[PDB]
Amino acid sequence: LNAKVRLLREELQLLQEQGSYVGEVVRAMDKKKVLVKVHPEGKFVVDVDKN
Amino acid sequence: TKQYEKSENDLKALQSVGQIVGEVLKQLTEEKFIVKATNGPRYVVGCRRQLDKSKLKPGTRVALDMTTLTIMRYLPREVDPLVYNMSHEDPGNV
Amino acid sequence: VSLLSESYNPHVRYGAAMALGICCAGTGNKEAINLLEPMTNDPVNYVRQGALIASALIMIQQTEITCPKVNQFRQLYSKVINDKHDDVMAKFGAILAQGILDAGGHNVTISLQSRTGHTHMPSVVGVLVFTQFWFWFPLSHFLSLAYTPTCVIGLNKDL
Amino acid sequence: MVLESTMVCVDNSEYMRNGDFLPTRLQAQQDAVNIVCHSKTRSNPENNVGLITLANDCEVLTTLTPDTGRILSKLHTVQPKGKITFCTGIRVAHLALKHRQGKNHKMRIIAFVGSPVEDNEKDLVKLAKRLKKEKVNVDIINFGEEEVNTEKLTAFVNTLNGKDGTGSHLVTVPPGPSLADALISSPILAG
Amino acid sequence: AVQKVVVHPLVLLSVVDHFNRIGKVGNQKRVVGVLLGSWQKKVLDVSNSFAVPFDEDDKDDSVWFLDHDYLENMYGMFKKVNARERIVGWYHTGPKLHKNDIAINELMKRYCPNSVLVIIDVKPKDLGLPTEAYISVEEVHDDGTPTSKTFEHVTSEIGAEEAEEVGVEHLLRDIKDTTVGTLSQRITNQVHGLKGLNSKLLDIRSYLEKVATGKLPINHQIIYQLQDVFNLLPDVSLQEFVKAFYLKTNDQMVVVYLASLIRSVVALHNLINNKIANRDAEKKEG
Amino acid sequence: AVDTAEQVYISSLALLKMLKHGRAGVPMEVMGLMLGEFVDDYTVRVIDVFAMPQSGTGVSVEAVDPVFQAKMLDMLKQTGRPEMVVGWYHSHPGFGCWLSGVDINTQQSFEALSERAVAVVVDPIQSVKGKVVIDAFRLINANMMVLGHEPRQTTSNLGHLNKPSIQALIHGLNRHYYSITINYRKNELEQKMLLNLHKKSWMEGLTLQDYSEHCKHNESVVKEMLELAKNYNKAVEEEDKMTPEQLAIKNVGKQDPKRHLEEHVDVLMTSNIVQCLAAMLDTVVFK
Amino acid sequence: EFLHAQEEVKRIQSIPLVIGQFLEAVDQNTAIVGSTTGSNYYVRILSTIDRELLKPNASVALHKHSNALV
Numbered sequence A: 001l002n003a004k005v006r007l008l009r010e011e012l013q014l015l016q017e018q019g020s021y022v023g024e025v026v027r028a029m030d031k032k033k034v035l036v037k038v039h040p041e042g043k044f045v046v047d048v049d050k051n
Numbered sequence B: 001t002k003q004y005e006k007s008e009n010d011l012k013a014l015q016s017v018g019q020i021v022g023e024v025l026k027q028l029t030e031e032k033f034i035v036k037a038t039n040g041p042r043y044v045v046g047c048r049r050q051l052d053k054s055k056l057k058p059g060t061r062v063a064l065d066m067t068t069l070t071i072m073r074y075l076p077r078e079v080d081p082l083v084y085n086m087s088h089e090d091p092g093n094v
Numbered sequence C: 001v002s003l004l005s006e007s008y009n010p011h012v013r014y015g016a017a018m019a020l021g022i023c024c025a026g027t028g029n030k031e032a033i034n035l036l037e038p039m040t041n042d043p044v045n046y047v048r049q050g051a052l053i054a055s056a057l058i059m060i061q062q063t064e065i066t067c068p069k070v071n072q073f074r075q076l077y078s079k080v081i082n083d084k085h086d087d088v089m090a091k092f093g094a095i096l097a098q099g100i101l102d103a104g105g106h107n108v109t110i111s112l113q114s115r116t117g118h119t120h121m122p123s124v125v126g127v128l129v130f131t132q133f134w135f136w137f138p139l140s141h142f143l144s145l146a147y148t149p150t151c152v153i154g155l156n157k158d159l
Numbered sequence D: 001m002v003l004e005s006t007m008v009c010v011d012n013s014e015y016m017r018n019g020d021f022l023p024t025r026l027q028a029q030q031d032a033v034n035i036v037c038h039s040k041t042r043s044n045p046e047n048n049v050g051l052i053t054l055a056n057d058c059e060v061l062t063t064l065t066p067d068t069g070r071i072l073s074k075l076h077t078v079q080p081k082g083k084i085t086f087c088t089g090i091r092v093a094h095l096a097l098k099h100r101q102g103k104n105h106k107m108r109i110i111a112f113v114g115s116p117v118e119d120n121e122k123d124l125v126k127l128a129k130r131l132k133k134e135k136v137n138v139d140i141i142n143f144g145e146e147e148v149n150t151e152k153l154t155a156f157v158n159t160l161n162g163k164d165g166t167g168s169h170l171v172t173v174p175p176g177p178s179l180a181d182a183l184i185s186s187p188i189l190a191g
Numbered sequence E: 001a002v003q004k005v006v007v008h009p010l011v012l013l014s015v016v017d018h019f020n021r022i023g024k025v026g027n028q029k030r031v032v033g034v035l036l037g038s039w040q041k042k043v044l045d046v047s048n049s050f051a052v053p054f055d056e057d058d059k060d061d062s063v064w065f066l067d068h069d070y071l072e073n074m075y076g077m078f079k080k081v082n083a084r085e086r087i088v089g090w091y092h093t094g095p096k097l098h099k100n101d102i103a104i105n106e107l108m109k110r111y112c113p114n115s116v117l118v119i120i121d122v123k124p125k126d127l128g129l130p131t132e133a134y135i136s137v138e139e140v141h142d143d144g145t146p147t148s149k150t151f152e153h154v155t156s157e158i159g160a161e162e163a164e165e166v167g168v169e170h171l172l173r174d175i176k177d178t179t180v181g182t183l184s185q186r187i188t189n190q191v192h193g194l195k196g197l198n199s200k201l202l203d204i205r206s207y208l209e210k211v212a213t214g215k216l217p218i219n220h221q222i223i224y225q226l227q228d229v230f231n232l233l234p235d236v237s238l239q240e241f242v243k244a245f246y247l248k249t250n251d252q253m254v255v256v257y258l259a260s261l262i263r264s265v266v267a268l269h270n271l272i273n274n275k276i277a278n279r280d281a282e283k284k285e286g
Numbered sequence F: 001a002v003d004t005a006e007q008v009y010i011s012s013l014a015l016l017k018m019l020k021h022g023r024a025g026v027p028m029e030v031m032g033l034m035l036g037e038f039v040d041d042y043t044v045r046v047i048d049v050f051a052m053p054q055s056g057t058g059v060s061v062e063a064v065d066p067v068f069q070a071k072m073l074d075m076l077k078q079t080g081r082p083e084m085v086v087g088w089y090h091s092h093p094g095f096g097c098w099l100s101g102v103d104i105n106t107q108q109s110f111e112a113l114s115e116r117a118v119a120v121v122v123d124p125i126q127s128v129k130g131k132v133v134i135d136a137f138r139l140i141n142a143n144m145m146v147l148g149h150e151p152r153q154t155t156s157n158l159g160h161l162n163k164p165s166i167q168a169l170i171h172g173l174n175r176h177y178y179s180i181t182i183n184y185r186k187n188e189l190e191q192k193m194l195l196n197l198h199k200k201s202w203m204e205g206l207t208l209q210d211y212s213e214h215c216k217h218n219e220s221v222v223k224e225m226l227e228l229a230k231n232y233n234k235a236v237e238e239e240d241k242m243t244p245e246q247l248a249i250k251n252v253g254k255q256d257p258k259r260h261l262e263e264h265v266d267v268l269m270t271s272n273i274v275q276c277l278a279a280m281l282d283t284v285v286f287k
Numbered sequence G: 001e002f003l004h005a006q007e008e009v010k011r012i013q014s015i016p017l018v019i020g021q022f023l024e025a026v027d028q029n030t031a032i033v034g035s036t037t038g039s040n041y042y043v044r045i046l047s048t049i050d051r052e053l054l055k056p057n058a059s060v061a062l063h064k065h066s067n068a069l070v
């Protein structure tokens, strides 16, 4: 329980500058990359993601 | 000769950046004011002691800090085309 | 001390690694090593350093055939010091630990307990002043008194 | 210039309301305060001079300060009615002189006594031996009416200092009509 | 008039640390300074203050003198940096005031219409909530004697706003906080009897002492009147206090029943979920 | 020439004035001045903190008034402690306390008069209460950029100070600046009373007054407040009695929550406060 | 120290904040939340209160940069 309040600190640090986005895959690519379209933004294409 | 130095001293006061406009939506507490920028984003901030809390009111045009994003000065109303709607001129009368 | 090594603050975790370091250095206990494995993995900087020196005292004069973690650790000492991303603090005790294992050309070790049953005071005094090496850097030289020779001397008599 | 801090004591006792001094002791001693404050101004700029009332309950109207505007402001409408108090009138000046910023400035006190005092000889001898230890030098100028050819105060000044101390000078006014500005002529020329 | 006052730990500390200023140079007497208050309502509040050099001669044991020019300059600086702050009165560290302190108020009464003097204590000992607050008023008397000025007690409380609570709570690092519901009410429950006793016991020893020594007055007038008021309450049954018994217990009736109501529910969720998570989780591992 | 680890000793009186002067200036950044004594290069202490008057131009190198300093120093010379000033501090209310181009402009002015002149930043906002908060900075020499910039000795406090890092803006000051450690000192006597002052604040004056007023409360409207608790115990429990049945539907504790769940702990704690303050009746009212 | 840790989770970020619209919680410990900037963000939920104030749709106040639910 003392470790969870510390975990919130580090996790805050990773989500502080950019947090994390919400993507929408329009198509997947042969190079392991994945065409992703964000609602406010333009379309991207991004890769593995080993998990 | 000295009037110039008066102007240059005015520049020293111009080293203070213009504040950012906004509106007052509500206020959650005295240190939590629910505000919105004229550009769309909404915020909750406290403020300094130079305000009168009752004078704030919802739906109020205010100016915010560039960092704290909080009210320092405020103005009631502004409109650009109005004075131009009042600037019409016509002779007569006669 | 297994449960104190899990404490929330790394200060008690540091003292807790040091306890196992200085007390078990005259022994080849593997349980102490097992509790000092996760200590170098803590995200805190200096606690990892503590694990380096403690693990250096458990392996004095003990080769790989003693405990299987000797080479495991010896690659870690050089790995942490050749990586620029790591903290300078943590990589201080790395080369320092390489000095512990290699002290005297591997020929000497530290012994707080003679076989006679009495404690060796230059050993104890040296190491206890060596506890805090940050506060005074020349205090790291008092550890040289803790080094004792391990040898078989077959001198018959006189010269 | 010599470094010191002078403390003036204006006489508001009920015996100063008479017009024996021309035109009245209030304006007579007021002009005395003007000449001494301008004298300290011409001496050194660092020397500061406050005032203290001796009659009734002693109160410091103006704390020690180098400007005389406040002093001249308090000389007016002072309402000079009460009984003179002497034994505490030197000690108050010493009290404001222990709070002084400068330790180089010597402790100096001037006071005007225009009324008889009920202080016993033993009290004044105790304060004399005390001011010797505190080294404080007090220059008194006697005004008004008192015991003819004032004795207790004269011997007080002589026994307060010694060797030399050149020193504390007590100038007693002779019983005759004269302008006050002419009475301050002898003390302002030499102590 | 004034009801209660609020003194912050910041200004209080500002008295104590000045006691360290004159502590090394000594010697006698006590720290005397002028208090800066903030008045937002009938309730009084203190924020900051400033010390003033003060010395009391002994001859002359009733002689008191303050620095007026220094007062002007320092109060002008604090009025410059803070427009809301102003002098509400003065303060001294006591520990007990002297008869001479009556005129000290009369001096600065030209600065403030009503100047409240606040005693404080630099060395905490006894008997409870620290400091003190006095207001200067004239109640005359039924005797027709000339008007006597006696200071009246004003209840004081320690408080703060926001930032001043931060440092105060941060620097302690000593005792649990609070904790409400368990150790906040019981500790103060013993505090009620303890601080009630010692207050009553020191003062009740005073009452027995006042007639032997300390006469006059002492007693009279204020003593006998409050004496009979103390004899106004015995105070128990007969009668109706007998009838409060079973309704107090009856207020405990539903409370014990609600207690036992949720006690079984706690045991419910805990035992059910844990025994399942015990044996059913262990059976898959081995 | 000699660079070592540094340490700041703060006084209980100092921090309290810091956060106050900073609170009154929000949002606008204020200008304070640090007061204390230089004992050596590797240690420093701040024994006092005094506030400067605000100006319409704001924080600037010219914001320090020399005549104001000589006056204030008059008031401090006649005080028991006439110690020389040491450095300056300024509040940074709305951000993460990074030194700006205005702060550096007054750093080189203090480094010529004072050898160290520790730069301190204090903000009430970034911390609720129990944080150590504040901050501290030091200007490294920019003309040394050709030689080794990498001390110190006794790197312990250096390691704990540079951590956590903690975002980016904080790291943007590693160059041209380096922080300096802060540690409290006691002064435990006055600290002991300072605890008991706030704690006793909740307690009563006579201590028999507000507890007996809570005894007047012990029957108010407390039978009605116990009817408030009775409605929470009916309304929360008849919907928390469907939960043991719903656990069989979802099988078993998968998310969830509802809620409407628990909350009886606070009800029992308030009822326990009621019964204890009510148990004081038989103690107080009787004798 | 645990009661002292509660102040560590309340400490960040205190004031000020930026409003957004809560969308939904993808699971325990992290959620997706629409910002007033008009962007949905995968964002952690504060370890203190994850539950009763969540609701399907509600205006939620977030830190400026971290967009962290409080």
Ligand SMILES: [Zn+2]
Binding pocket: F029, F059, F090, F099, F100, F102, F103
């Ligand atoms: Zn700045």
